[model samples]
Target: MTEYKLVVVGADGVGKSALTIQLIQNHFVDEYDPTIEDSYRKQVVIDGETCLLDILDTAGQEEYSAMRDQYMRTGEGFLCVFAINNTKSFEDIHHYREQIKRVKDSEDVPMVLVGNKCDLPSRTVDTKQAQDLARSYGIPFIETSAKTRQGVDDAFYTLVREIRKHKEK
Candidate 1:
């Protein structure tokens, strides 16, 4: 009742790992490093209930596919992220979505479609376009900027509730 395995997934350079660190540490990280895999646990209150978030920031490159299926097997919920400025990242969002459904073997796996790095002025992905994407996937959507802490908690906490509804059903 106190644990949730929430995986943050996206193409490389989407800043999913940065959001992971921000969720756990409450401090924004500014970097352009590669993350093959990382896991963390954070106990905090969400909607007046204490819950432990077991967050897994997954690798974004194609070469790291080995570790993906294993983690996908355990993820109760997922944050499928893409960079608004990187068209390829948004294109890759579909890749992760398909993989998660395949790994979970279900069409209704809890997920939130995230458009990260929204603070940038030069944007390639539009909000309405992303919302339409979310609509097609039948999942929640969030726009976030880890460096600016925009929608940081909203993104994670919203997924927490999504997982809540999922497990309860």
Candidate 2:
């Protein structure tokens, strides 16, 4: 079976941990706890193929910024997240992409642009805007809600598919 390492990253309180936890546990968490770094493993099936997914939910605080490169280097794919209600988080996604590209030294690395908290009523980031950015980067863009489980499965599923395709190349 193939194995893939994926990292979830975004600004603090942008729901990176929420998305990861919900995807793995199939339950939503209401508590807000800052993550240092957490790892989760699961066997996933895609198109009748089985693969192991190793997900690293990294800290979103500025204090952990220096350590992100190590995760980027080890990660086979990245879920660059941003909360729809958080403008700053959306703005920082480019920096995350640049860092990963720099560390991996590959312009065509597997990545998914994730807009989280779609259940929230107040949205500061527009869907079209995020879609345009993802198109520019040539990566998949998906809006998800960990609370309502909307598009959550597709986000990780698409990332896994991209990772598999990248490995094939």
Candidate 3:
């Protein structure tokens, strides 16, 4: 396995930064991270194959949404994250997919739909709608909690797997 350039994209305050750092640092941070952009790399063994994960955590600020296309063009796979409690952000998930496919010029590109902040009790987007959206996009979907580390590894690994599959096709 070589390097996988993956991006985490979502609207503001949806835990885009939190999920990535939690996967890398193995801990949760409650403090708000006003991310303009951030990058991290880790060597992980997924399915017994050693792969380099180059993760980009982006700013959710709409002003910085201008920065999305460049990374979307370069990224090998995408993690489209949205908060479970926020339906507004959830709706924006389709925007990222369209932009990614527009930039990459391929609807067959590797992508994963992620619902973050599953640790919270309240939810505006339920599992049924989430799965339906994933089916519509023909991509895998998963729920995660950066605070609890629940399904964190699975989410990233699945993206890597998607990259492998997309490449082979």
TM-score of each: 0.92, 0.93, 0.93
**44-118 in candidate 3: lDDT tens per residue?**
999889999999988745643545566568999999999999999899998989988888888698999999989
Where model 1 places Cα greater than 4 Å from the true spot, the runs are: 60-68
lDDT of each: 0.88, 0.88, 0.88
| lDDT of residue 90 for candidate 1 | 93
Error of 3 at 72 (Å): 2.4
Better model by lDDT: candidate 1 vs candidate 2:
2
- Pitting candidate 1 against candidate 3, the one with the higher lDDT is 3
For model 2, the stretches where C-alpha displacement exceeds 4 angstroms are 60-68
lDDT of 3: 0.88
How are the candidates ranked when ordered by TM-score, highest leading?
3, 2, 1
Number of backbone-clashing residue pairs for each candidate, in the order shown: 0, 0, 0
Candidate 1 local lDDT, residue 80 = 95
Top TM-score model: 3
